[PDB]
Amino acid sequence: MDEFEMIKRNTSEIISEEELREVLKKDEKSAGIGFEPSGKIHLGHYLQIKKMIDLQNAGFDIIIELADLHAYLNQKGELDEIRKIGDYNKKVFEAMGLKAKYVYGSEWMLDKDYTLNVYRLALKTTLKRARRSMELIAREDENPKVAEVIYPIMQVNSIHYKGVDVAVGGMEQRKIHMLARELLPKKVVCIHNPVLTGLDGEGKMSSSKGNFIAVDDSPEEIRAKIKKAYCPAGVVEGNPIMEIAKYFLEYPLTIKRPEKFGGDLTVNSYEELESLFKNKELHPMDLKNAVAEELIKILEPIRKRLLEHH
Amino acid sequence: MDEFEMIKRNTSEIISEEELREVLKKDEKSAGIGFEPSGKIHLGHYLQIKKMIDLQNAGFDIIIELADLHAYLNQKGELDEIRKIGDYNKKVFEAMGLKAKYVYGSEWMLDKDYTLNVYRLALKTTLKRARRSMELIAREDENPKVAEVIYPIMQVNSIHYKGVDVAVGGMEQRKIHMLARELLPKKVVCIHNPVLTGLDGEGKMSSSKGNFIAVDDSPEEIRAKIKKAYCPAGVVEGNPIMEIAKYFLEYPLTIKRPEKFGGDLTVNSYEELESLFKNKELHPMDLKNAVAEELIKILEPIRKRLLEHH
Numbered sequence: 001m002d003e004f005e006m007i008k009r010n011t012s013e014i015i016s017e018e019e020l021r022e023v024l025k026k027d028e029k030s031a032g033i034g035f036e037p038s039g040k041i042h043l044g045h046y047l048q049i050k051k052m053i054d055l056q057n058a059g060f061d062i063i064i065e066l067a068d069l070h071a072y073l074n075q076k077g078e079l080d081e082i083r084k085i086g087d088y089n090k091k092v093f094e095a096m097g098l099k100a101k102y103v104y105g106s107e108w109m110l111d112k113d114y115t116l117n118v119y120r121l122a123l124k125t126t127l128k129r130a131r132r133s134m135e136l137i138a139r140e141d142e143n144p145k146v147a148e149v150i151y152p153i154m155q156v157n158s159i160h161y162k163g164v165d166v167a168v169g170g171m172e173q174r175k176i177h178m179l180a181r182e183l184l185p186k187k188v189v190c191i192h193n194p195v196l197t198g199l200d201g202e203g204k205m206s207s208s209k210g211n212f213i214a215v216d217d218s219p220e221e222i223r224a225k226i227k228k229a230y231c232p233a234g235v236v237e238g239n240p241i242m243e244i245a246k247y248f249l250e251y252p253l254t255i256k257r258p259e260k261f262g263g264d265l266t267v268n269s270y271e272e273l274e275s276l277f278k279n280k281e282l283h284p285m286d287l288k289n290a291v292a293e294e295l296i297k298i299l300e301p302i303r304k305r306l307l308e309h310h
Numbered sequence: 311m312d313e314f315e316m317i318k319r320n321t322s323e324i325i326s327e328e329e330l331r332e333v334l335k336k337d338e339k340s341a342g343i344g345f346e347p348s349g350k351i352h353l354g355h356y357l358q359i360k361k362m363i364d365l366q367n368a369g370f371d372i373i374i375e376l377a378d379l380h381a382y383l384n385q386k387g388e389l390d391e392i393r394k395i396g397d398y399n400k401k402v403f404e405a406m407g408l409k410a411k412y413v414y415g416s417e418w419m420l421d422k423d424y425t426l427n428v429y430r431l432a433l434k435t436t437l438k439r440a441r442r443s444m445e446l447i448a449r450e451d452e453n454p455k456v457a458e459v460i461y462p463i464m465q466v467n468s469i470h471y472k473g474v475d476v477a478v479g480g481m482e483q484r485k486i487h488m489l490a491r492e493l494l495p496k497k498v499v500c501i502h503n504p505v506l507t508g509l510d511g512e513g514k515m516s517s518s519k520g521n522f523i524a525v526d527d528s529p530e531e532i533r534a535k536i537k538k539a540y541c542p543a544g545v546v547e548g549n550p551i552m553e554i555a556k557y558f559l560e561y562p563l564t565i566k567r568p569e570k571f572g573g574d575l576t577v578n579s580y581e582e583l584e585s586l587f588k589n590k591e592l593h594p595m596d597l598k599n600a601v602a603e604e605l606i607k608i609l610e611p612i613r614k615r616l617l618e619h620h
């Protein structure tokens with residue numbers, strides 16, 4: 001692959017491709033993503049950090065916002081506690097191999113100039129639009145707070161303030177990103193990563209829904225989680241195990257199985273793996289076993305770096 | 311009257327009376343109101359400044375917020391223009407005889423501490439509540455902006471930040487004030503003045519509805535405005551002319567009229583005036599003539615101070 005196709009790989013959408021082409025030519029180009037600090041860092045975070053790495057390899061300076069005020073506004077607790085978890089997440093992202101500028105949003109979100117532009121943007125952001133942009137982000141609340149509609153403006157403002165050429169996020173960030181593209185003088189290139197399905201297939205992988213594999217889960221726990229995971233034979237869509245094979249595993253992939261079940265199977269691409277699964281040539285139990293053992297090897301250096309701290 | 315009854319006079323409500331009693335005892339007590347800067351200063355503004363004067367006479371230090379960022383958030387234009395009109399309004403309020411601390415909201419509304427508490431309060435203010443509190447304040451907008459729900463939080467925050475014991479406003483400010491009483495550690499005493507009816511009786515006196523008498527209107531213009539004004543015989547409620555007699559005129563009041571219409575009439579109180587009007591003992595034309603001529607004499611020193619600037 002070339003640089004553009006390496007950035008595009010395993011993304012849901014790039015907004016837009018020609019604009020990304022314009023960016024790649026620059027000697028200096030920056031790319032940002034922000035994370036509300038999370039008690040566990042899971043495969044959904046890893047997918048996005050993997051993509052920030054792809055950009056760093058393509059010559060981007062990477063900015064990681066530890067979004068403490070966003071988490072505060074989205075009801076994750078008190079600021080000092082959120083910042084502690086932010087610092088923990090930083091260590092995890094470094095353990096994943098991302099050397100970047102890790103910044104707390106509150107480092108600039110209280111500047112007078114920034115705050116004035118929050119108010120400028122509030123004047124151009126309709127309440128309906130702001131709520132639409134938060135539908136997949138806002139913490140469930142039967143009595144939604146004003147903080148919910150401040151949140152999207154502040155993300156747009158930070159895209160403006162930190163001056164990134166590229167914003168990266170999960171597909172759930174797309175409407176906030178389409179606000180930023182509409183409201184800001186410089187249109188940011190937006191790279192949207194897929195939203196992983198949760199292990200039970202009930203919804204999306206979520207830190208608060210307990211349907212995730214954490215990057216520092218133990219081998220036994222990964223095996224237990226994958227064993228129980230939704231994985232209907234032949235079904236690829238909404239299949240979290242097929243998702244993990246697509247987004248995290250390396251190919252060629254040797255799938256070990258007994259000779260009585262057709263013997264070990266070497267598949268050279270996820271597309272062949274999908275073909276072998278769509279028609280029950282590969283059983284869920286054998287897919288799960290290989291997905292488990294290979295995911296373990298992938299996360300091992302991460303877990304190990306984190307374990308060494310003890 | 312004593313101090314409490316002088317403050318209460320011609321108010322719609324005091325929240326609450328016992329709390330105001332506690333305040334009056336203090337050697338130092340402050341009272342605030344804020345005005346979005348307005349191209350014309352009208353009898354509605356004067357009624358509130360008259361009440362700030364009542365408080366100043368009762369030993370309050372008065373704070374007048376020229377609410378430039380509020381007007382900005384409520385779509386009155388650009389900040390520099392709004393501030394010009396703010397400075398004009400200050401001159402008008404001084405011409406009314408109020409010597410006070412006149413402060414632009416933007417002087418403190420961009421402080422880091424203030425802005426952080428905006429976000430704290432956004433977490434405790436529901437979007438429904440915030441919109442309810444703005445129903446009589448927000449500029450008409452088919453596509454309401456996020457600025458609309460930031461506005462009420464910022465007013466509450468300023469009540470907190472500027473530390474007033476008493477907040478004064480028209481009845482349309484009551485729901486914002488009931489937020490401040492619920493959210494802030496120190497419960498502010500709220501003094502609500504009536505909302506004057508517009509001259510056509512169609513609604514409330516408004517700077518943007520052209521149904522007002524401005525304090526610097528010329529005598530001929532006051533007469534023309536009062537002549538055309540809604541004033542049905544016997545009807546006192548919603549009658550702007552009866553309102554002006556109640557809130558602005560001094561009693562005893564001599565009402566001049568021809569001998570053929572019963573001759574000049576001296577009424578010692580608005581209550582007697584209301585009695586003489588409820589049963590058509592006093593005609594609208596005669597009420598209007600006296601209300602016009604006496605309102606002119608009341609506003610004359612104000613108009614004159616303002617004219618001297620030319």
Ligand SMILES: CC(C)(Br)C(=O)Nc1ccc(C[C@H](N)C(=O)O)cc1
Pocket residue numbers: 032033034035036063064065067070105137155158159162164167168169173
């Ligand atoms: C400033 C830059 C460009 Br790094 C940026 O994109 N900031 C940002 C991004 C995402 C989030 C949280 C996010 N909405 C979520 O749901 O987790 C917060 C802040």
Ligand SMILES: CC(C)(Br)C(=O)Nc1ccc(C[C@H](N)C(=O)O)cc1
Pocket residue numbers: 342343344345346373374375377380415447465468469472474477478479483
């Ligand atoms: C800070 C203090 C205590 Br002086 C205060 O009350 N500020 C305040 C009051 C009213 C308004 C505007 C008002 N909502 C309107 O509709 O005109 C803006 C700011």
